[PDB]
Structure 1
Amino acid sequence: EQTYVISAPKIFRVGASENIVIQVYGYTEAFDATISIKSYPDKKFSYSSGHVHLSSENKFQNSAILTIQPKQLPGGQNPVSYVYLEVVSKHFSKSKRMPITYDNGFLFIHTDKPVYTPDQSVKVRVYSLNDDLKPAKRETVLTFIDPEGSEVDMVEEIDHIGIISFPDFKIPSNPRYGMWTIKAKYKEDFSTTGTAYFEVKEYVLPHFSVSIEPEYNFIGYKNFKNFEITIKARYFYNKVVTEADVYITFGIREDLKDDQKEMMQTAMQNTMLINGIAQVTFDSETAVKELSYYSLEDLNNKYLYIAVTVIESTGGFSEEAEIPGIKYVLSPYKLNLVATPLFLKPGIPYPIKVQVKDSLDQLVGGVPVTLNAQTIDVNQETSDLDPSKSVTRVDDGVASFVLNLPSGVTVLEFNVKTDAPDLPEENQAREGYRAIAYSSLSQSYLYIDWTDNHKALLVGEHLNIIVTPKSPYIDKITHYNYLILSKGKIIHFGTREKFSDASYQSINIPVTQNMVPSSRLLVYYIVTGEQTAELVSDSVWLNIEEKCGNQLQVHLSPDADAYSPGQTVSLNMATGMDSWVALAAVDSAVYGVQRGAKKPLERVFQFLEKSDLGCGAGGGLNNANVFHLAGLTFLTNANADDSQENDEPCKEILRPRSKPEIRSYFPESWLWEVHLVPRRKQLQFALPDSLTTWEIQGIGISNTGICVADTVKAKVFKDVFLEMNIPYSVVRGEQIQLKGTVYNYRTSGMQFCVKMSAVEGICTSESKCVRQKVEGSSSHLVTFTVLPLEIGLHNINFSLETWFGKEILVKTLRVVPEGVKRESYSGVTLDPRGIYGTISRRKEFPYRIPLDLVPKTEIKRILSVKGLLVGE
């Protein structure tokens, strides 16, 4: 018998080097075979064709890189939905109708930092990659959008290496506070999208970060007379808070999108943070009743609000921090199969991996889970399998189970309920499932089994995988035939001869860097039923190790673990091959202003592995299902591939989630440069006068692709120093009290003397030197009382005089005007063609001043014009 097979990606991608595996069990007699991609309802245009020559030479198997570029319908857009794969050969032919997408590659929008003050420039750049993970040079158009969903500016640059550097985006003149958006797209035809976000707020860099850790994320029966809260404050230069006065309040809340709340009086206050830490236990029972409530059951599906205020006792700084909310719920847990394909093989052991979550979508380990199971036979027989138990892992959140199904089985019905010792039986949640047998005209099945809950494979290894083909009417299996996908392109293909000896046998397949983010492998064999061959298969999903093509390694010169507040130092670039690299320096405190998180990298692994057309742990229900679910569709001789149910969107879960010293330059972001790195480079620069941790991330793109490095922490730190608590802006008129503390880290004490240098438009108490006394290893609250008169005016110096120290502080107070901030706008529609019935070419907006105006203030205005384009 002659049976033929073609394997192709489920859907083609425009401009992707789409690989097409061709495998056959033809006569030794070698032969040529043309393969092509032609247009819809007419095989006129053939966009690409590939002359693959096969024989006993290549164990009857080839690869062909067809590709589909811009030959299309551009004007009055009708961009084609479909194309036609074709096979032309001496021995045979056929053809396929296959869909087409313009989703091609990856746009990574790299903002300089995630939080800005109005009148900052937003640095931004892009890393763009094509389906092959190479540079992919296409001119790209990001477009700025305000927090009122309204488009604002729009700009293109050409892409020279994959690191597109756009001009800095100055935030508008009276801009809108909130969540801004950068949307990036190719100016060219491909559909591809990128998004990023930044917050605009009046914000001030925050001196120390206050952590606030609750005992759990649910509140329930165990912890309702006590909920432990540890709060850990420390400075951004790695030295914790000695003495601080704490204040905690609590409140009731409806939800997490809830703008407001109902406070509770009698809320524990005045624990003192001692040497890095403080703790309290919140009796919800006694406190909650002071509002309406009386039972926890009364209080169901409601959230609890915590907000803390840690003012340094000896050190002039208020800091604030808060927890949105903690849910009060009966049902403490959620359930969901992690790496469980819902299709079973009879005369095999089924694998079941379950997951438990708290109300806030994070793992919970140590919880026991009961699995009840029920089997029904091909015979229509109904049977009770024996109930099992396991306990959810702590590193996983996953409890695993295995049941060996009586081989005559068709349908498995399983219950999964939690069994935590403190919860009422009714409160514990359950989910139920059904699993279904892979249908075999053959009565023939396959089960390829590989799993490690340890869960990670490392490039370089050799994969050893066990193939058991239980059942087939005949074991006259000639060949085992596998196929390995990664990021939606077929990358490996091959054949192992059946051992008369084995029944089950090994495959050894070398793990390669083509698979780095993740991969699938699929294995099929032909059973020629001497009347119509059947294709029989199974696939498996394999997360592997995160190793770059060009591992970038970055190092600071002076290996010392603490650094000095002015010092120059060199940086080290490292690469396995010539590369580009894109640097960033961010004040590690500035991540502290937004509770939300930095987002290069974590993402870069994930975005890149979302080109996989598959779904599930693999392993279908037909032979067609298998190949389809695996991110493929075939053209076939024995069993044809049927379905077009690519449509319903994929969801499963795969991975479970003199001698003065002058301090002046306090840059939030720096090192926003890019460099050509010939496997080696170095560059010196004097790191800025500022006591914080500098967190400096380097990411490099190269022939191989992208690779983000391990971020480099570099805390700069002085022994004795002064830093003032300066408000973002102050209003001219009312007198203000300026705070700020001197920090003495030296093992002996000292006598010191602070004094301020005022500018022409700012006031002060007298006119000296007010000599005080700071103990060994402490701090002293110092304050000055000023009053602003000239608006906008900046520059205040603070000078420090001590034992073995001399420090001058260069700060820049900012000032605003009294009264209100009225906003008024007008507009026109320019309509040269009198479309509306009257032709419009000019409006005149006259300067007009209302005399209610606050003295010495400008009248601003801004001209915004939004071309109004319409039409399909």
Structure 2
Amino acid sequence: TYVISAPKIFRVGASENIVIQVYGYTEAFDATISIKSYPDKKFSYSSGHVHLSSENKFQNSAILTIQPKQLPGGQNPVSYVYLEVVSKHFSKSKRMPITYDNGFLFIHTDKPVYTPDQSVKVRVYSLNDDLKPAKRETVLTFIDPEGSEVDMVEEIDHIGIISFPDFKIPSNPRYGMWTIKAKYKEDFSTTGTAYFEVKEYVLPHFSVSIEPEYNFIGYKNFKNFEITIKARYFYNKVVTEADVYITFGIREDLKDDQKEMMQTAMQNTMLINGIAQVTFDSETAVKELSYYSLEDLNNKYLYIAVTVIESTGGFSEEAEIPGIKYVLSPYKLNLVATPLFLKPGIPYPIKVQVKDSLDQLVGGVPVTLNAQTIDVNQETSDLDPSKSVTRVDDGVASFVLNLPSGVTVLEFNVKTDAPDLPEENQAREGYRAIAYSLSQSYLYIDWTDNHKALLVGEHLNIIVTPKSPYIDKITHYNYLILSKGKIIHFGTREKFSDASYQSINIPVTQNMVPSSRLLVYYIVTGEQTAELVSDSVWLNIEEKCGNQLQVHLSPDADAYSPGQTVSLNMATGMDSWVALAAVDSAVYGVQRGAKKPLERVFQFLEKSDLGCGAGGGLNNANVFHLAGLTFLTNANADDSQRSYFPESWLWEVHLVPRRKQLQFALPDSLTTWEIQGVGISNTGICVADTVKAKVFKDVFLEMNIPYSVVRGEQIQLKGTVYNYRTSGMQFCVKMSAVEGICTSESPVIDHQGTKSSKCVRQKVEGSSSHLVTFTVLPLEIGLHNINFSLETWFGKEILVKTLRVVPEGVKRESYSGVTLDPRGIYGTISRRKEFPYRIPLDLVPKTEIKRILSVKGLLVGEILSAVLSQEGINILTHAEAELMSVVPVFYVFHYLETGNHWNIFHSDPLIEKQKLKKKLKEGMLSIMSYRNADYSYSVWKGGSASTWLTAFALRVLGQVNKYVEQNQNSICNSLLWLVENYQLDNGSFKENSQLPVEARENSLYLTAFTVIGIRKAFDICPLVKIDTALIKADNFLLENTLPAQSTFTLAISAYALSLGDKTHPQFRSIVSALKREALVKGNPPIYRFWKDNLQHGTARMVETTAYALLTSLNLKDINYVNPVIKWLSEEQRYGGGFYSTQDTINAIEGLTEYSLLVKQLRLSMDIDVSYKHKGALHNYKMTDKNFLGRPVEVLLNDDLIVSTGFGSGLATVHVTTVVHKTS
């Protein structure tokens, strides 16, 4: 037997409890389990040990952890796990998939809406699987809604609530839905995602809620559809009276925001007691504006706009609804918390749910189902249908069906029944439920969570039944309750003959509040083989906090006066850290309701469950895989298949004992402040209930203060004062404006600052208001403070408001941007760049040009492979092939010098370097021995002259030039010899030492070889004649490579041309043709190579693959080079090359250039941007970890110069010019 129960997916850095059970014996033997990596042989993460005895009934569980012991780097970082068991009677091994998905990230922002130039207060809640704080480092990145990253910030977590610095909005924001991601930045998973929109939340006057009588218009609502529009203030009081304007429309989809609309209404209704309702018929709309009147024709959304204005004072608020589409098909059905499986003889509950078109449950719709109970052996009969209605509060319809013991599967067709829904247009969804076995044994647990969901602290009884077992005598009962993919407790009971079904008592704990699962499996002893049966059902309970954190203010009153000192008292069960956040109730823009800050702590925590579904299923393997476990037993196996007042405030973190109280002052605002707190402790996370702190005032004044007021034009500035006293009164309101705004008083009285409005005391009835307007025209750039004094009975108060203006025209232009190149990879070196500051002639008077600068960190090259070995030991020293022997030593030394890797050998690098230098000297003497009197290069005694070997030796000498020395006079005349003799007037090259198109093919081959040689030998001997020869040969190659002749010739010509000019039109055409002629394997291509023969010591394509690799490396494209590197690393070569070493040295040079270009992409650039005639503005330190830059505003008008030191890498700087131009 030896049944080992373990979770399906282990978590790195987590305590995974592994349990083991034994069939039982008179002797108590110990067991041992260990955690080993992919090497069997030879690694071990941890080793746990258990103890078995009669007291423990031969079962025990030990927690195991997975720590960062994995190999750094590599092609795969996980190598998930190998699990073994060390026991006296049994020993077995099995692999199991794991994942770094451990813990959770709860990003809590103070506000969902942000304005330009505003601080961003945000905190991240780090958690473990055991709800512990799990103090870990965390990085936070910001993404522009257009998809570009903005800034990254890292911070170490010491308390448990990750506090981050306040971010700043750039001078040129991008309106839309932003993105916030957080990672642990070293080795972890479970990246968290948060969203926030940047918009204008200046002032919402009153919330307008649109609650229709029905969710979606049906057949009965087509002739008459009544909708309720209610507008209420933010301080929990309804609106007395207001004029409501209704606007209707028809939209085809939710993506299209602009559509035609009536044009018929324009219905004017009056808001009474904060609630208004109007009847709107669809027939008139579909007849007049829709251009076709039929409900079958129009299947598209219905957009309704609502504009509510106050009749007693100038104000306006708008709301909207996405759309209501007329769909012929009724609402769809689905099953939730309902296992699609069967238990014979036991009543199987059926819980179905009806949802609308767009993700919302429906209630009050009667539904019925048709079921057919089939027999296991022979014919069947039809089960009696049942009909029931769905409740609006529960949302799920309940059904129960009793089936005989001889049923195998069942099929039920749940259909909807409604007076308006016809038979043709009806909602029907068929499903099938399959029962559980070779030993005919079954198992069941009852009550299907219909208690309903339970609390913590009360004991629950569950009935189990081993119907038709293998043998009447059962050894023991075994059951395991799990939660969050871990085994919290393991149960055990005994079986007696007192009854057929036994009830087991399971104590509930605090760690199981979000969700849980339990599985009951019992093993039997067969005469030949054993077989165990298991079963599982979901566990849904309530949600009770362990810390029990509650927030309550010490003063108990329905309304609070502005500025009143209040005290807040926290009450917790244990010591915990609190995170308070006082968020206004008015910050919630329309924004499709602006749902909630988090609203989900357990629902998002439920994702820790590995398995899906409720429970139950096929044989033990399938049901354990569905429950999220993997078992190990002998019987069966498992198949993997400024004031006042801006929001928000109170952003603090304090330590909270069992009772802690703090004192502060309430701000001055008419809206209700919603305080919220989150607790972090060893028990777990808990979010406190949002307590609404109502700040109310008897007589107050509020105005529109519009946004982005264009300078030069007057505004209406409509506002009203609210009077809530029972008795009437007379009010006086005067306005005071700072310099300088044109005022219509002429002059002020009495002081220079105080401006008298010559107020006439007007009567205001009880629970009424009066309209007050002011005509003002701004003359200067914002922001300017404007005073509003209200002299009225029952005390007086003055309020200060801020006004911001915006110039007339707005024109944004990037107009500039460069990529800084430290080492001169692409083209010439580019490290210092001057961006001149210019002023267009269309500049608006009194306007300052704003510029923003930032860097992005384009990319970093891959570290796929750099392999070279066994050459020094096999062929180092071991007649005409002395050149062939000594040439590859030069390239091996070049690769060793480029890669800078000598620690692989035990010997000292200096001795090996000296030996390689001695071998290079021997090779130089050998290549000097091959020099004839005519300065040419020959192979056999100098009888005939060959240009191929001459260019080969020129390549060798050019490679030598970079390390020790080479005589220039012996190379210049050697190149002049070839230029004079072997250079054709057309540009071709030939050799003296020895199918019409084959001659031209060989001519182009020799020409490309000579071009490569002369380009390699040109850097040391610059000459005008050599440059002329290079130009002529390049012209020849560009003219004669137009037809597709051969892959090898095309590749060698492309490389010979890439050694020179790399941005020629015909060269780019040749490169495109070679890329089209490339061969790939896989999607995406893992291996990329080139074949000479079409539809064809046998590997001849390696030469052209190496030439194309060198050509691509000359273009500095890592993504295109990586597959060729994978190809040349291991393939069918075996190898597998010619001459040699015509291709061996080419492949060595390709690997060398690959390693060099990988070293080129290090991103060690140190950017210091400064002004030409003034001080430095900012300095950027670019590294591999921090590849992004923070935007910096440019205010002072001066020439901006961005420069860097030596550096190593590749990064691009972006700078835009935001200038207001009239317009």
TM over 0.5: same fold? yes
- Seen in structure 2, the aligned counterparts of structure 1 residues 360 and 101 have a Cα distance that, compared at 3 Å, is same
Output the CA distance in 2 between the equivalents of 1:556 and 1:593: 30
Matched, 1:553 2:550: yes
Deviations 1:393-426 (A, max 9, x none): 2222211222233323222222111111221122
Residues 514 and 793 of structure 1, relative CA distance in 2, 3 Å threshold: closer
Deviation at 1:222, TM superposition (A): 0.6
Contact 1:795 1:812 (C-alpha < 8 Å) held by counterparts: yes
Change (3 A) 1:793 1:610: closer
Instruction: State whether residues 449 and 540 of structure 2, in contact with CA within 8 Å, keep that contact through their aligned partners in structure 1.
Output: no
Counterparts of 2:766 and 2:391, CA distance in 1: 48
Q: Aligned to 1:271, which of 266, 269, 272?
A: 269
Structure whose residues are more often strand by fraction: 1
CA distance in 2: counterparts of 1:775 and 1:386, whole angstroms: 69
In structure 2, relative to structure 1, the CA distance for the partners of 1:601 and 1:864 (3 Å cut) is closer
Secondary structure at 1:791 match in 2: coil
1:286 positional shift: 1.3
How many Å apart are 1:348 and its aligned residue?
2.6
Q: 1-side partners of 2:629 and 2:2: how far apart?
A: 17
**How do 1:145-164 and structure 2 match up within 5 A?**
145-164=143-162
Distance in 2 between residues matched to 1:296 and 1:551, nearest whole Å: 57
Distance 2:646 2:295 in 1: 52
Q: Which runs of 5+ in 2 are unaligned?
A: 746-756, 862-1222
- Give me the whole-angstrom Cα distance separating, in 2, the residues matched to 1:584 and 1:515: 28
Change (3 A) 1:391 1:454: farther
Contact conserved, 1:135 with 1:162, CA < 8 A, in 2? yes
Report if the CA contact (8 A) 1:347-1:470 is conserved.
no
Q: Deviations over 1:464-523 (max 9, x none)?
A: 111122233433222221011101101111211113122112011011112111100000
- Structure 1 position 593, deviation (Å): 4.3
Q: How far apart in 2 are the matches of 1:530 and 1:401?
A: 42
Post-superposition offset of 1:41? 4.3
Q: 1:507 aligns with which of 482, 504, 507?
A: 504
Which of 750, 757, 769 is equivalent to 1:779? 769
Give the aligned CA root-mean-square deviation in angstroms. 2.3
Secondary structure at the aligned position of 1:595 is classed as: helix
Change in 2 beyond 3 A, CA 1:145/1:494: same
- Deviation of 1:332 after TM superposition, in Å, equals 2.8
Q: CA deviation at 1:205?
A: 2.3
CA contact (8 A) 1:351 1:402 kept: yes
Deviations 1:253-310 (A, max 9, x none): 1122222212112225111101211110110111221124444433443111111111
Superposed counterparts of 1:237-386, under 5 Å: 237-379=235-377, 381-386=379-384
The separation in 1 between residues aligned to 2:41 and 2:35, in whole angstroms, is 9
Secondary structure in 2 matching 1:605? coil
Provide the C-alpha distance between the structure 2 equivalents of 1:107 and 1:137, rounded to a whole number of angstroms: 12
Structure 2 equivalent of residue 74 of structure 1: 72
TM-score by length of 2: 0.68
Shift of 1:81: 3.0
Deviation string 1:107-137 (CA, Å, 9 cap, x unpaired) is 1111111111111111111101011210111
Q: Please tell me whether the aligned partners of residues 12 and 101 of structure 2 are also in contact (alpha carbons under 8 angstroms).
A: yes
Q: CA deviation at 1:170?
A: 0.8
SS at match of 1:223: helix
Bigger shift: residues 469-478 or 687-696: 469-478
Change beyond 3 A, Cα 1:538–1:300:
farther
> Shift of residue 51 of structure 1?
0.9
Q: 1:151 to 1:612 in 2, by over 3 A?
A: same
Aligned CA distance change for structure 1 residues 598 and 245 (closer, same or farther; 3 Å): closer
**Structure 1 residue 214: Cα displacement:** 0.8
Confirm or deny: 8 A CA contact 1:264 1:288 kept in the other structure.
Answer: no
**Partners of 1:6 and 1:23 within 8 A in 2:** yes
User: How far, CA to CA, are the matches of 2:457 and 2:310 in structure 1?
Assistant: 53
State the distance in 2 between where 1:454 and 1:796 align. 62
Rounded to whole Å, the distance in 1 between the matches of 2:813 and 2:499 is 83
1:643 CA displacement = 2.9
Larger deviation, residues 763-772 vs 79-88: 763-772
Equivalent pair of 2:698/2:725 in contact (CA under 8 Å): yes
Aligned to 1:521: 518
2:301 counterpart SS class: strand
Structure 1 residues 590-599 or 787-796, which shifts more? 590-599
CA distance in 1, matches of 2:393, 2:465: 31
Displacement after TM superposition at 1:631 (Å):
1.2
Match of 2:533 in 1: 536
Check the 8 A contact 2:175/2:198 in 1, yes or no.
Answer: yes
Q: In the alignment, is the contact (CA less than 8 A) between 1:4 and 1:26 conserved in 2?
A: no
Contact 2:113 2:200 in 1 (8 A): no
Distance 2:169 2:294 in 1: 48
Distance verdict in 2 for CA 1:194–1:792, change over 3 Å:
same
CA offset digits 1:632-678 (Å, max 9, x no partner)? 1111122222233xxxxxxxxxxxxxxxxxx9321210000110112
CA deviations on 1:785-823 (whole Å, 9 max, x unpaired) are 100101123101111011213121100111111123332
* Maintained 8 Å contact 2:333/2:353: yes
2:812 alignment partner, SS class: coil
Per-residue CA deviations over 1:701-758 (Å, capped at 9, x if unaligned) read 1111211011110110110111111112211111111011100000111111111001
CA contact (8 A) 2:722 2:770 kept: yes
Per the TM alignment, residue 188 of structure 1 is displaced from its structure 2 partner at its CA by 2.3
Q: Secondary structure at the match of 2:294?
A: coil
Contact 1:203 1:593 in 2 (8 A): no
In the superposition, the TM-score normalised over structure 1's length comes to 0.95
| Whole-angstrom distance in 2 between the partners of 1:825 and 1:502 | 87
**593 and 685 in structure 1: CA distance in 2 versus 1, 3 angstrom threshold:** farther
Gaps of 5+ in 1: 645-662
Q: Secondary structure at the match of 2:228?
A: strand
In structure 1, the residue matched to 2:404 is 406
Instruction: Note if contact 1:450-1:540 (Cα within 8 Å) is conserved in structure 2.
Output: no
The alignment partner of 2:597 has SS state of coil
Does the Cα contact within 8 Å between 2:415 and 2:429 map onto a contact in 1?
A: yes
| 1:737-786 CA-partner distances (Å, limit 9, x unpaired) | 10111000001111111110011021221183332221122100111010
CA distance in 1, matches of 2:351, 2:660: 47
Equivalent residues of 2:220, 2:420 under 8 A apart: yes
CA displacement 1:316-370 (0-9 Å, x = unmatched): 2111111111121122311011122222222332222111112232222222211
Between stretches 688-697 and 497-506, larger displacement belongs to 497-506
Counterparts of 2:771 and 2:575, CA distance in 1: 53
Whether the 8 Å contact between 1:218 and 1:329 is mirrored in structure 2 is no
The sequence identity of aligned pairs, in percent, is 100
Question: Is the Cα contact below 8 Å between 1:305 and 1:326 reproduced in 2?
Answer: yes
- Deviations along 1:827-863, one digit per CA (max 9) or x if unpaired, are 1111112211321111111000111111110111111
Distance 1:433 1:228 in 2: 37
Q: Which structure exhibits the higher relative contact order, with contacts defined as CA atoms closer than 8 Å and separated by 6 or more residues?
A: 1
Give, in whole Å, the separation in 1 of the partners of 2:356 and 2:783: 52
1:741 and 2:739 aligned: no
Distance 1:634 1:43, change over 3 A: farther
CA distance in structure 2 between the partners assigned to 1:566 and 1:278 by the alignment: 35
Q: Distance in 2 between matches of 1:850 and 1:55?
A: 90
Secondary structure (helix, strand or coil) at the match of 1:828 reads strand
Judge conservation of contact 1:300–1:330 (CA < 8 Å) in 2. Answer: no
Does the 8 Å CA contact 2:33/2:47 hold for their aligned counterparts?
yes
Query: Residue 527 of structure 1 aligns to a residue in which SS?
Result: coil
Tell me if the contact between 2:4 and 2:632 (Cα under 8 Å) persists in the aligned partners: yes
- Give a deviation string over 1:158-193, Cα, whole Å, max 9, x none: 011220100001111111000111100112201121
Contact 1:205 1:593 in 2 (8 A): no
* Separation (CA, whole Å) in 1 of partners of 2:574 and 2:229: 46
Contact 1:203 1:728 in 2 (8 A): no
How far off is 1:380 after superposition? 5.2
The change in CA–CA distance for 1:54 and 1:597 in structure 2 (over 3 A counts) is farther
- Separation (CA, whole Å) in 1 of partners of 2:447 and 2:91: 36
Q: Which residue of 2 aligns with 1:672?
A: 651
CA contact (8 A) 2:584 2:671 kept: yes
**How far apart in 1 are the matches of 2:590 and 2:391?**
35
2:469 is aligned to 472
- Cα distance in 1 between the residues matched to 2:502 and 2:168: 64
Separation of aligned partners in 1, 2:417 and 2:451: 25
Does the CA-based 8 Å contact 1:363-1:396 persist in structure 2?
no
